[PDB]
Enzyme design. Structure first.
Site, PDB file in Angstrom:
ATOM      1  N   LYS A   1       7.490  69.512  30.680  1.00  0.00           N
ATOM      2  CA  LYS A   1       7.073  69.186  29.328  1.00  0.00           C
ATOM      3  C   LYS A   1       5.743  68.366  29.247  1.00  0.00           C
ATOM      4  CE  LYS A   1      11.573  69.640  27.199  1.00  0.00           C
ATOM      5  NZ  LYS A   1      12.614  68.972  26.388  1.00  0.00           N
TER       6      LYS A   1
ATOM      7  N   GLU B   1      11.185  73.612  20.895  1.00  0.00           N
ATOM      8  CA  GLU B   1      10.129  72.739  20.454  1.00  0.00           C
ATOM      9  C   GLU B   1       8.909  73.463  19.945  1.00  0.00           C
ATOM     10  OE1 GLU B   1       9.719  70.515  23.971  1.00  0.00           O
ATOM     11  OE2 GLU B   1      11.702  69.660  23.799  1.00  0.00           O
TER      12      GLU B   1
ATOM     13  N   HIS C   1      10.315  78.229  23.208  1.00  0.00           N
ATOM     14  CA  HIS C   1      11.097  77.039  23.486  1.00  0.00           C
ATOM     15  C   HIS C   1      11.362  76.435  22.164  1.00  0.00           C
ATOM     16  CE1 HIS C   1      11.837  72.915  24.528  1.00  0.00           C
ATOM     17  NE2 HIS C   1      12.332  73.452  25.640  1.00  0.00           N
TER      18      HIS C   1
ATOM     19  N   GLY D   1      14.972  69.866  31.807  1.00  0.00           N
ATOM     20  CA  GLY D   1      14.077  68.946  31.151  1.00  0.00           C
ATOM     21  C   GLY D   1      13.887  67.700  31.961  1.00  0.00           C
TER      22      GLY D   1
ATOM     23  N   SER E   1      21.515  70.356  27.789  1.00  0.00           N
ATOM     24  CA  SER E   1      21.185  69.270  28.727  1.00  0.00           C
ATOM     25  C   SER E   1      21.879  69.338  30.091  1.00  0.00           C
ATOM     26  CB  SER E   1      21.159  67.874  28.157  1.00  0.00           C
ATOM     27  OG  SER E   1      21.468  66.972  29.202  1.00  0.00           O
TER      28      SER E   1
ATOM     29  N   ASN F   1      11.224  72.146  33.468  1.00  0.00           N
ATOM     30  CA  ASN F   1      10.191  72.098  32.477  1.00  0.00           C
ATOM     31  C   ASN F   1       9.676  70.691  32.377  1.00  0.00           C
ATOM     32  OD1 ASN F   1       8.449  72.405  30.163  1.00  0.00           O
ATOM     33  ND2 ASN F   1      10.174  72.783  28.765  1.00  0.00           N
TER      34      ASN F   1
ATOM     35  N   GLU G   1      19.087  77.819  24.640  1.00  0.00           N
ATOM     36  CA  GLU G   1      19.035  76.408  24.301  1.00  0.00           C
ATOM     37  C   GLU G   1      20.041  76.058  23.232  1.00  0.00           C
ATOM     38  OE1 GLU G   1      15.139  74.533  23.716  1.00  0.00           O
ATOM     39  OE2 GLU G   1      14.218  76.531  23.568  1.00  0.00           O
TER      40      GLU G   1
ATOM     41  N   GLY H   1      20.190  65.924  20.485  1.00  0.00           N
ATOM     42  CA  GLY H   1      19.960  64.693  19.749  1.00  0.00           C
ATOM     43  C   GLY H   1      20.822  64.639  18.518  1.00  0.00           C
TER      44      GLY H   1
END
Lengths: 253, 255
Positions: B11, B97, B95, B233, B212, B9, B167, B173
């Site tokens: 992004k 996000e 997704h 990613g 990740s 992706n 995901e 994070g």
């Protein structure tokens, strides 16, 4: 003092086949024009190919929207940096349909503005009133409202090299029609609003008519001093029609 | 029974130049890879170009999201049919996000999924829970919901020929890491859940890990039997990284 601009919004319409048929046709119809600036705004996917297609003409490229990020972890967003990279120049924002389908705010839109400005793109700002506001006599309240989103927080200068589009949402799809007198009247209001702040910048904004334009009205349309052009919808899909909106502008202003 | 899919992706990252280079690089680095399927998802405006760059390779094309309409007056929207036209195959829907930034919901997501299918595109259904949720051990509760949105309304066959990506949101994070173990358990739960409806469809489905994943990561993960690929990613923007990842899925799933 203001060169006319006619932009055709394809909205959600296209294919390669069509990209080809229509760019080819626009080219031909559009040969001879000179007095008018002409841009097109296809779906995002088709911008690149459309640029190829238009190569060798004066047809300019645009886009129907952007998001706020330039790069980063933003799956599916649209980057102005990438629009710059793609060769797109004129970026529609606050199109009535996103305000309504998508709930885009003035603030949001106004952020969208800042950004384009930042990359050096040309924002086409889309403003105008609902059936109700219109009826309530709230045109100017709204308009100004929609403009101050930028002016207030960015300054009159934000408007240098900018374009505004007036959408009479209330005429659109409602068995309502706007006259030329009506629009020019709103156009003056817009110009005048910015003039109260910065007159010189006001002289140089391109205020396009975003309502319904056809051959029976284009000319009576472009004859109004404050109407610098048109942001064209459905007719941007038929070459011939498109081009007449165009030559009316050339002819007129 | 399941051939790996590594999907990158990109992004909010790309340019005519980057597309040109990265694809080249990918073409080289993936020239002699046999058993892993590969797709990339550039920014919508790069697709065409990238599909052009990819001609002659097995690198398949993708897109970051769609909208619901096919045509008409919807300035700014994306049509699955134009996606089809332009050559994309795999489409990322739901997704984290989007769910988080664009407040996309399970009902819209399912819808999107529906349209994709009417059209012939492979949906890439993203799910996963938050830190908040995960904390609360609402893991399977959440995943199940997100799955059932399509399941309970479109049937197991809706997943036929489809792809799901889990995901680990709560691990993005946040400061956490998911072990391959932790992740395989979800994968499996996800597989079983579908399995209650139709176990056949179930062992068919591609469940890529969407947490990740890098050059060093890959091998631990592809080892799990319920992880049949990755949606990558950061790494996809590096051909050498990316290509290691792909080779690992190749190696892991060899048999």
């Amino acid at each position: 003092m203001r060169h006319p601009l006619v932009m055709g919004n394809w909205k959600l319409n296209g294919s390669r086949h069509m990209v080809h048929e229509l760019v080819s046709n626009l080219r031909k119809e559009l040969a001879g024009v000179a007095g008018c600036a002409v841009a097109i705004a296809p779906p995002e996917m088709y911008i690149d190919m459309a640029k190829r297609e238009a190569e060798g003409s004066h047809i300019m490229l645009g886009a129907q929207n952007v998001n706020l990020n330039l790069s980063g972890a933003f799956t599916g967003e649209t980057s102005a940096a990438m629009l710059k990279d793609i060769g797109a120049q004129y970026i529609i924002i606050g199109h009535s349909e996103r305000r309504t389908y998508h709930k885009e705010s003035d603030e949001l839109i106004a952020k969208k503005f800042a950004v384009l400005k930042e990359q050096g793109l040309t924002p086409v700002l889309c403003i105008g009133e609902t059936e109700a506001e219109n009826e309530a006599g709230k045109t100017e309240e709204v308009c100004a409202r929609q403009i101050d989103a930028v002016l207030k927080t960015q300054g009159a200068a934000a408007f240098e090299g900018a374009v505004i589009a007036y959408e009479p949402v209330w005429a659109i799809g409602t068995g309502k029609s706007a006259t030329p007198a009506q629009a020019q009247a709103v156009h003056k209001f817009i110009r005048d609003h910015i003039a109260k702040v910065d007159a010189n910048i006001a002289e140089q904004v391109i205020i396009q008519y975003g309502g319904s334009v056809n051959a029976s009205n284009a000319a009576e349309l472009f004859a109004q001093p404050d109407i610098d052009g048109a942001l064209v919808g459905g007719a941007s899909l038929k070459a011939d029609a498109f081009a007449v909106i165009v030559k009316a502008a050339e002819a007129a202003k």
